[PDB]
Symmetry: D2
Amino acid sequence: MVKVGVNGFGRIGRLVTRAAICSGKVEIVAINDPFIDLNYMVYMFQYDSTHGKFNGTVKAENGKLVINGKPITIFQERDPTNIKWGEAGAEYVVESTGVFTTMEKAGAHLKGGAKRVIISAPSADAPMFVMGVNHEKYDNSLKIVSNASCTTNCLAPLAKVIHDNFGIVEGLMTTVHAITATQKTVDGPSGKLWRDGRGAAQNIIPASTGAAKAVGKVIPELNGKLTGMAFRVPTPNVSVVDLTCRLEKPAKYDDIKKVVKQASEGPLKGILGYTEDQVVSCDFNSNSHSSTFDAGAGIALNDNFVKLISWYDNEYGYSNRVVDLMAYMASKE
Amino acid sequence: MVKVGVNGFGRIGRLVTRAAICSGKVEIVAINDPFIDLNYMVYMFQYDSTHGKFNGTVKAENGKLVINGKPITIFQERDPTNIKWGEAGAEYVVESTGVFTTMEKAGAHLKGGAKRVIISAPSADAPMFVMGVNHEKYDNSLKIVSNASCTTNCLAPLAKVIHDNFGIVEGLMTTVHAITATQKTVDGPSGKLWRDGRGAAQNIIPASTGAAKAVGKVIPELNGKLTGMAFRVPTPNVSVVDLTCRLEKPAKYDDIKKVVKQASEGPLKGILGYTEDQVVSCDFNSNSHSSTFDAGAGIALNDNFVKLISWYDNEYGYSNRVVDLMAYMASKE
Amino acid sequence: MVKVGVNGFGRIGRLVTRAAICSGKVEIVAINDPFIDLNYMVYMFQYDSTHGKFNGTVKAENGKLVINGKPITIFQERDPTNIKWGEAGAEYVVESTGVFTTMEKAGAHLKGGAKRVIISAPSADAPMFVMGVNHEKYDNSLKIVSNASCTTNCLAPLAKVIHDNFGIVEGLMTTVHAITATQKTVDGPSGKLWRDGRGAAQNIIPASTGAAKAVGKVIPELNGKLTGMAFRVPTPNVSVVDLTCRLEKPAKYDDIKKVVKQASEGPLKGILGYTEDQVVSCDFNSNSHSSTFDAGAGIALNDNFVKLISWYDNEYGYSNRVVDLMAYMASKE
Amino acid sequence: MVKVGVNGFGRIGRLVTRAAICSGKVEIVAINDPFIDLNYMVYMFQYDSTHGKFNGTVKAENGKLVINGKPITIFQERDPTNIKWGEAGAEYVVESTGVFTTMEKAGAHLKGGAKRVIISAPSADAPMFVMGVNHEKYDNSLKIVSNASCTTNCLAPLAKVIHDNFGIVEGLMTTVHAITATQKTVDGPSGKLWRDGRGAAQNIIPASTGAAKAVGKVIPELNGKLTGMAFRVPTPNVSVVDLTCRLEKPAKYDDIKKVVKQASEGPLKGILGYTEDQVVSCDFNSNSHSSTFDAGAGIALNDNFVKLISWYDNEYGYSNRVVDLMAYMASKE
Ligand SMILES: NC(=O)c1ccc[n+]([C@@H]2O[C@H](COP(=O)([O-])OP(=O)(O)OC[C@H]3O[C@@H](n4cnc5c(N)ncnc54)[C@H](O)[C@@H]3O)[C@@H](O)[C@H]2O)c1
Ligand SMILES: NC(=O)c1ccc[n+]([C@@H]2O[C@H](COP(=O)([O-])OP(=O)(O)OC[C@H]3O[C@@H](n4cnc5c(N)ncnc54)[C@H](O)[C@@H]3O)[C@@H](O)[C@H]2O)c1
Ligand SMILES: NC(=O)c1ccc[n+]([C@@H]2O[C@H](COP(=O)([O-])OP(=O)(O)OC[C@H]3O[C@@H](n4cnc5c(N)ncnc54)[C@H](O)[C@@H]3O)[C@@H](O)[C@H]2O)c1
Ligand SMILES: NC(=O)c1ccc[n+]([C@@H]2O[C@H](COP(=O)([O-])OP(=O)(O)OC[C@H]3O[C@@H](n4cnc5c(N)ncnc54)[C@H](O)[C@@H]3O)[C@@H](O)[C@H]2O)c1
């Protein structure tokens, strides 16, 4: 059971902890967040507006955060170099602050005795992995890796299946995406991204994303064949992917449904989901899949030009794939 | 100006009333709504959560709705065949109830001596017109007419410019659409449309729309080449079109911007807009355009495959177009 | 194990069904709702935007809704006298349609062979009971009863503790309350409650409520000493009571906290809760208490004039009280 | 017109600017905000999610922000001691950052040449003024003043009228308050105000407020007779006070209505409003009154115990009062 420290006890940091506890695939032994002290951590982890009260016990005791009788070391460092992950026993580190996405910044945890670091975001230079799509290309020389973005984890498993069976000539993706922490309650300053500063609950907000091009990194055959953009809308969680693509081989929509469902029951089970029910976004709150294909929502213009819809819990789905990737990395040591 | 009766004093009926008064192109003289009495019509027309309090006077005076000194006859009839449009002097009738959208049902208004009917919705069998696209196909023999859907009025002006300049081989459309009256505040019964019954402000809700199909009706050359679907999101008003289309002729994104903005400054002024600002949805509330191209939000994959974004105030833009079509129909008499 | 039919498979009817199964205190055998056919009930019972996917199996089998392997008879009657509650073995009927709240109208269920009716709302003439306050005044001569309102089940337990210990001279209550099914997604017609027609997700909407007055009926010593009003605010669920009362005997706040906490762990356990944590409304979603005293949110002016705050899940708290009352009435036959 | 410099170009800062231009009572000549450069200021002033687009011109030219052709000097300083207000002609400074609310901190603008400072918020030690209530107590020796909070500006005009006619023995106040910039879009860190950290659009959030107590500063006869608390709710703007008070002299609700209405038509014109319509909060967006009595929402228990209800646009009503106070101060020089 690989021991894990979390840097950044935010949405992703706390839900990784819930998924680590829930699945037992990894063990959280240390947490670091300079803006959330140990008593505050008890509160932030126990109560959750989106995913509900934690089902379990959580207390502060002898300076450690004790969750289900298991004590966790709490640090309060702003500079990742000064965290002593080694003496806390943390071998792997989840880099879920949002501000250390480069190998040089993420490498700071290796000074502290961490063995490897998993950035919970896309990186400019760290190798990116998507469970079920290219994770087997991880090898032990990579001490710093990225689990990509939540959108790419929705789009790449779907894209994998469509391209393997039919061939994607080209594709454009829109993601209608839930609100996140970088947004603003009311019109306010947002530096380089003026749209993101506008009132979160008031607006549909266009945003730029590299998540679709990133699919070309996890699936090299799709390099230069996909891009896309995003709309942020006033919901607290759960997001949807809309992939308009042009297929090489003609495929009836029922054929797309059969290979996607088949893949959801086989090698991609737990990653790629399939449904034909009249779902809406709240039906995926706390759903641990990366991607759930929505058979009824999509629509074909003809056998070579289709629009495919897939849901994802950007918070809890992505957190479960951070856990899965660390479990798999542990298994290749 | 032609004298108009309004059947259904809902979102569209009251905003069509506002658009007439504001523009002065047509004159409301009569209104029918069996679920809203005269005093309640003073309240619902005066106050508006989305567009604000009406700027002007509105009162109940001796059985008439008096707006800025002008009296409007009020009817309370469930069956359109019993509305006495002639007596009130109403020559055209805007059918905006949502429940009389076929030729046979909307024709009931001619028994009451109205001369023409304009259905504020798509119709299965009435001729469909869109200002700036095919409205010069209207002729005086058509007594029952559809102004199509808000989404069709957004997409068809943009498609027209693109198809005229580069050729649309095929296109798939998504509209992120604000909430409407057919939705529910909490999970509740929704007849044949299960997703529509789910809590409106809690969910992204996939939905069908034939708006993209209906462009093939106002632009016959694109018949069979466009379809799409919708996402209902939790905002009060303003919607956005997301069109992914294949072009015949290679088009750089700068060339698309230029022909669209050229269209907006010329023959499609007031109908198709153009902006390069970092807009969000609220910036189009109470905007009277049919469609506003967002130059920074869209994205090209290559010279023949692009995604184009266009905003539309689904309430007030559409209502202005109903007015415009009636003024145009009037000028043809 | 009393057998129960549900009239009205809405918010309350489906959470009463859920609470019945989850608690085991009563057995649902019959459900009637002319607007939800059998396949639609599978869908509406299984997916819930507010409370999540039902944790168990639900399917349609041989004309029966089969929940956790137990089949339930489905009726589709609009007139209650045509429901054959007797043949389906329903002994008690939960009247949760919102449109049969008086004794003459709710008595229609006795024609079909039901032996008692529990109206899931206030009633003009049927006797009202609140669990933990006055439920022991129920006796076997009463075949039509009302379980009052959600707000009354929150207010009455707190008001009982405060009054039994310090005497309430007079009190005024505001409840800040979540969206309910009678509200509209956008400004639309609302019969005689005009403010209720305005866009639910955009507005704070003042509203009348007889809940505070009704406490005088379940606590007769408080007759004519309490009234109040409501604000409907854009949340899907969970409401809060804000009670401002004059006391007879001087009471410092910490003494009010002490006796309320003591009540919450004694005879009002499971009905009246108590907390000192920094809670907000989502921390009570799917909470089964009638009323949770919020220690840190209240405030006193002096020892005789205080502002008391209590949270309640207006959907799930109330539905459990319906189930609890029917188990109590069954035990007394 | 006194020349005014604005420190903090946020909700209040920008809307004070709008109000100043719309009313012509003071002139804006300088703005300081180190987190919004010139070109971004053009965008943030031009577009407003809550209040609509600026009706007028705004552009950047020669390093100045030019609004309706008049040039405004732009500083980018984090320490108010370094702002050269005097050189830019700014004689009064609106301190609207939220981080310099004491006299020792707000006095920092005096070293730059400003003559007086108006803190846009409550202050621990600066004299507070509420227009229409105690503004005549201002005199020219006062160089650092406070315009109190939005809520105090709503409560004090009403309290004044009620107290001058009937005598307030004691009162308790709840404000149902819209979201502000200090809150979070999702559950995040919030110092020692833990509840303020929870998802703003997801929750009813109880919060402390000094507003009712502050009424005792602007109306000394009521010192120590008022307190209360707050509920933050998911609306972008407009708030409501709920004052529960005991009266000394008996007052039937009609008498309360009558004196509030005559105050709103006389001395408190433009500050205290009166309405009997079925209003909801959106009906007060961009309303410039401090406080609008809602006659139909309130309720009396008896002739000495009553609950009074008053709306306020916390953004624009407060902003207009900052302009009114500065104009009144300028008339006194
Ligand atoms: N849907 C999502 O929320 C989502 C999904 C996928 C990926 N991500 C990404 O994961 C990362 C975390 O995202 P999040 O949503 O949890 O944001 P968040 O704001 O909720 O959490 C960020 C945390 O970083 C903490 N932190 C710890 N050390 C810090 C330090 N030295 N400096 C600054 N902050 C420090 C902060 O206190 C804060 O709690 C981001 O890169 C994000 O883009 C987010
Ligand atoms: N809201 C939009 O964005 C939009 C845009 C374009 C087109 N439309 C279409 O316009 C039509 C009306 O839409 P809406 O949003 O205004 O719905 P709405 O519910 O707001 O208005 C419907 C009105 O019709 C009244 N009504 C019901 N039955 C009636 C009857 N027999 N006779 C007369 N009046 C009756 C209702 O009381 C109500 O006031 C629909 O077909 C809609 O699809 C809507
Ligand atoms: N939602 C709450 O928080 C809450 C709390 C306490 C009490 N109540 C009361 O419970 C009752 C139901 O409330 P709700 O929120 O579930 O409303 P709802 O609209 O969600 O459900 C009402 C159900 O009744 C069905 N129905 C309508 N007419 C019917 C008829 N003749 N016969 C059988 N079924 C019919 C409807 O299809 C609908 O499903 C109301 O009186 C309400 O005041 C509601
Ligand atoms: N928002 C309301 O409803 C309301 C109403 C009445 C009073 N107030 C009070 O007015 C003040 C402004 O609050 P707000 O939320 O509307 O504004 P805000 O949070 O939207 O912006 C405040 C501005 O201060 C800027 N700023 C300028 N100089 C600064 C400096 N040295 N350091 C830090 N920031 C600087 C920041 O960029 C920011 O834009 C607060 O004290 C508030 O309590 C607010």
